[PDB]
Amino acid sequence: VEYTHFKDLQALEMERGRLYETIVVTWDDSMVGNAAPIGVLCTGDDTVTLYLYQGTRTVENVLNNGRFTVNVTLDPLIFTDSTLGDLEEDMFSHYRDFLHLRGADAFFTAEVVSVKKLVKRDRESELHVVKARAGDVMRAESFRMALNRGIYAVIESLIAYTRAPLVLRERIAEMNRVARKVGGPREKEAMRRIIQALES
Amino acid sequence: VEYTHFKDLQALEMERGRLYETIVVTWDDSMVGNAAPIGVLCTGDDTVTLYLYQGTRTVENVLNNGRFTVNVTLDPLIFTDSTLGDLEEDMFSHYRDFLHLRGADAFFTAEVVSVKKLVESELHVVKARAGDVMRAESFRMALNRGIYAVIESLIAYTRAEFSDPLVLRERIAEMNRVARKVGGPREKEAMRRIIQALES
Numbered sequence: 043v044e045y046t047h048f049k050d051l052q053a054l055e056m057e058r059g060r061l062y063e064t065i066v067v068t069w070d071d072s073m074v075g076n077a078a079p080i081g082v083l084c085t086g087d088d089t090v091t092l093y094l095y096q097g098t099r100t101v102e103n104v105l106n107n108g109r110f111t112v113n114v115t116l117d118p119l120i121f122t123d124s125t126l127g128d129l130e131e132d133m134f135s136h137y138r139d140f141l142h143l144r145g146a147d148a149f150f151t152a153e154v155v156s157v158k159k160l161v162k163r164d165r166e167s168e169l170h171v172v173k174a175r176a177g178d179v180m181r182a183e184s185f186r187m188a189l190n191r192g193i194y195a196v197i198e199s200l201i202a203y204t205r206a207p208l209v210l211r212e213r214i215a216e217m218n219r220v221a222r223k224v225g226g227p228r229e230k231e232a233m234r235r236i237i238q239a240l241e242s
Numbered sequence: 243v244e245y246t247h248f249k250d251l252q253a254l255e256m257e258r259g260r261l262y263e264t265i266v267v268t269w270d271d272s273m274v275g276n277a278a279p280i281g282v283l284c285t286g287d288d289t290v291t292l293y294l295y296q297g298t299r300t301v302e303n304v305l306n307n308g309r310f311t312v313n314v315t316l317d318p319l320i321f322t323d324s325t326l327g328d329l330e331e332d333m334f335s336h337y338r339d340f341l342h343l344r345g346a347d348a349f350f351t352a353e354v355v356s357v358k359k360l361v362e363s364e365l366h367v368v369k370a371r372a373g374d375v376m377r378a379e380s381f382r383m384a385l386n387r388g389i390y391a392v393i394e395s396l397i398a399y400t401r402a403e404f405s406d407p408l409v410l411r412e413r414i415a416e417m418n419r420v421a422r423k424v425g426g427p428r429e430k431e432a433m434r435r436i437i438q439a440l441e442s
């Protein structure tokens with residue numbers, strides 16, 4: 043596809059504080075491409091943060107060269123093929139000396155400005171918090187939106203509500219976590235309203 | 243907000259065989275507005291199908307006057323408020339002899355062309371023709387859960403070794419149901435690959 047060059051992330055309509063599901067493309071020093079789904083937190087007009095688990099090709103590539111592209115797509119097969127295994131050589135395109143996803147609705151180049159270790163606890167792992175600056179922002183005519191799970195978590199909770207015991211509370215809890223993790227104040231307020239109606 | 247008029251559903255990039263999550267606005271004889279989330283199956287350039295469970299105001303209104311609008315929004319509080327209770331009067335607007343959702347990114351008028359009663363619960367299958375298609379500048383996409391069903395399945399997949407096979411089995415089963423019901427060939431194929439990978 044053909045890309046139009048834009049100044050920054052506002053052309054992708056990314057909003058400060060939201061986490062976007064994206065395909066992150068990285069490469070080793072032989073320029074062998076790697077792709078994987080990674081959440082990308084928008085922190086400002088031209089900055090993002092990534093939270094990267096240890097021992098993946100994504101983190102090792104990124105810590106080795108400080109470079110990556112973030113790629114917007116809504117194709118479930120790209121998310122699937124880059125999770126179950128590796129994308130084929132032909133899924134990688136060059137842009138200057140960055141690689142990106144062939145056929146991405148939008149991508150931006152990114153350079154690492156800081157990295158920080160971080161203990162994660164849920165249900166203990168150590169992660170890298172990688173803050174980056176966006177360089178060139180490339181948008182195709184096929185771009186519509188960057189994928190965000192906030193609206194989906196509210197929708198799944200409403201559907202569960204319409205059919206409302208331990209599983210339900212559990213579903214509502216997973217969805218609330220997702221909404222707080224990735225969403226904005228409207229999503230979080232939606233979740234509050236739903237939990238309120240469930241308590242009643 | 244301002245709308246542009248369009249001929250058919252292609253303007254909203256709805257695809258045949260996909261189910262969209264929308265707000266359906268209906269009204270009684272006194273033109274009292276009702277809004278509720280309803281799935282809308284796109285069946286062609288200007289046709290849709292709705293599946294309407296018994297005993298809602300939505301079905302009562304639609305079977306009574308054979309008219310409604312389908313309204314595109316991604317606002318989580320609108321889905322939430324119209325599920326938990328009722329939208330207030332200022333949430334309805336006029337278009338010709340139809341009501342629509344005030345502030346919708348897009349809406350279309352629809353006229354019932356046939357209805358069929360299905361049998362536990364009673365269900366009405368309502369086929370309708372799309373009339374005027376009205377698109378605002380804020381329009382990006384109509385909401386569809388297919389990509390989210392894949393996304394949820396892939397996260398569950400990456401967490402496979404760390405959770406109990408039973409909840410995992412059930413979550414994949416349910417995301418499979420969603421992709422089947424709402425999704426296109428790519429989402430269905432994605433789910434097929436995921437389930438296969440889990441079985442290996």
Ligand SMILES: Cc1cc2nc3c(=O)[nH]c(=O)nc-3n(C[C@H](O)[C@H](O)[C@H](O)COP(=O)(O)O)c2cc1C
Binds near residue numbers: 076077078101
């Ligand atoms: C939708 C989704 C979101 C994900 N987000 C992250 C994330 O933000 N950070 C991370 O380290 N891994 C994340 N992952 C998991 C990685 O994609 C997964 O570990 C992948 O196998 C890494 O492969 P790699 O070794 O090629 O880098 C995510 C996976 C999915 C399916």
Ligand SMILES: Cc1cc2nc3c(=O)[nH]c(=O)nc-3n(C[C@H](O)[C@H](O)[C@H](O)COP(=O)(O)O)c2cc1C
Binds near residue numbers: 278280
């Ligand atoms: C995301 C979502 C999709 C829904 N889809 C349908 C559907 O297609 N058909 C239906 O009968 N009800 C559907 N519902 C449930 C109704 O919205 C719900 O019963 C609502 O309370 C009806 O309100 P009413 O009495 O104003 O019509 C859906 C609910 C949600 C949250």
